[PDB]
Amino acid sequence: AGGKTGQVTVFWGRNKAEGSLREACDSGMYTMVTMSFLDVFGANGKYHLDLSGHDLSSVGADIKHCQSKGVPVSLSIGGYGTGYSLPSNRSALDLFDHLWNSYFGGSKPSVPRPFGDAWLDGVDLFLEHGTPADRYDVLALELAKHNIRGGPGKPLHLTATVRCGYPPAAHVGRALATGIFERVHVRTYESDKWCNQNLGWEGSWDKWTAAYPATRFYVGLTADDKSHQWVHPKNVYYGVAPVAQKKDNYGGIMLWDRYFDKQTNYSSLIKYYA
Ligand SMILES: *[C@@H]1O[C@H](CO)[C@@H](O)[C@H](O)[C@H]1NC(C)=O
Ligand SMILES: *[C@H]1O[C@H](CO)[C@@H](O)[C@H](O)[C@H]1NC(C)=O
């Protein structure tokens, strides 16, 4: 049976008023910060990073500062938008190259590095949109092969942030089928009828965790106390946390997002139940 792990992953980059990345890591509330989102990519070779107006000039320094404090920083690709797809093996490999040379251990004269010499700690796949033609499995495998634990490089935490419902959309299922994802953040705060904190998340949680034994599962909760899917701390303590932790592959809690958490201080208590 699983149990508390003390792990709390939070999303950052959705609202410039949420403070700098450095501030997030300095709060001592998170064990991982995931920036969002690289929202444009595909078979045409055009890539875009959208951090909602945040000052990009200081992100590199903040990333390194976070890492020095033991807080890894990841980059989520995708999002709720419609500007991305990965319809071929070639497009998947080109995206890997772009990520590698722009944010990780790669270096190419023609490719600028948004955060300078900072080297990110992971990649999260937030694939709201996709088709059976997408090849996220090819991208995932390449990223997994660069998760080095005993050689020239550093660990790369490969994750996916998915909808509550099981089974997942085909393109997500194809990627997860590789079996090499380290963590999956199951969003239980979407309005999805039959599958959210109000009703059905537990059943889906059972299916998700059982289907991917090698992957650690995080319960995704919203820090927006105005949401109909918000879970009061006392209900996380006596309900959500205990139930989620019954599974052997429970990994922790994911929070959406830094902005909301900053306004409600949700993690102040939640980090103790994770
Ligand atoms: C694309 O990659 C997948 C997985 O490696 C492979 O099964 C498929 O044959 C590839 N498509 C081709 C033939 O380029
Ligand atoms: C949570 O703590 C912060 C500390 O700065 C405080 O500003 C905030 O008002 C608190 N949350 C509430 C009750 O709004």
Range of the domain at 139: 1-274
- The CA distance from 119 to 21, in Å, is 15
* Cis preceding linkage at 112, omega within 30: no
Contact 133, 91 (CB under 8 A): no
Contacts of 231 (CB under 8 A, 6+ apart): 197, 221, 239, 240
Residue length, the chain?
Answer: 274
Name the token pair of 222. 């919203």
Give this entry's resolution in angstroms.
1.8
The CA-based dihedral angle spanning residues 117, 147, 252, 258, taken in that order and rounded to the nearest 10 degrees: 20
Name the residue among 52, 64, 49 with its Cα closest to residue 114: 49
- With a 6 Å cutoff on the Cβ, whether 175 touches ligand 1 is no
Q: Determine the Cα angle at 191 with ends 190 and 197, to 5°.
A: 70
- With a 6 Å cutoff on the Cβ, whether 138 touches ligand 1 is yes
Active site residues: 128
Contacts of 183 (CB under 8 A, 6+ apart): 9, 157, 158, 159, 160, 215, 216, 217, 218, 251
- With a 6 Å cutoff on the Cβ, whether 89 touches ligand 1 is yes
Q: Which of 86, 88, 89 to mutate to test the pocket of ligand 1 (most atoms within 8 A of CB)?
A: 89
Experimental method: X-ray
Name the token pair of 144. 């997994």
Contacts of 110 (CB under 8 A, 6+ apart): none
Strands (E), 13-146: 32-40, 48-49, 73-79, 122-127
Contact 103, 113 (CB under 8 A): yes
- Alpha carbon nearest to ligand 1 atom 2, residue: 89
Look at residue 58 and give its three-state secondary structure. helix
- With a 6 Å cutoff on the Cβ, whether 140 touches ligand 1 is no
Bridge partners, 124 (sequence order): 76, 159
Number of domains in the chain: 1
CATH number at residue 115: 3.20.20.80
- Alpha carbon nearest to ligand 1 atom 5, residue: 138
- With a 6 Å cutoff on the Cβ, whether 268 touches ligand 1 is no
- Alpha carbon nearest to ligand 1 atom 12, residue: 89
Q: Which ligand is nearest the CA of 90, by number?
A: 1
Distance 89 CA to ligand 1 centre (A): 7
Contact 26, 73 (CB under 8 A): no
Distance 223 CA to ligand 2 centre (A): 13
DSSP 238: I
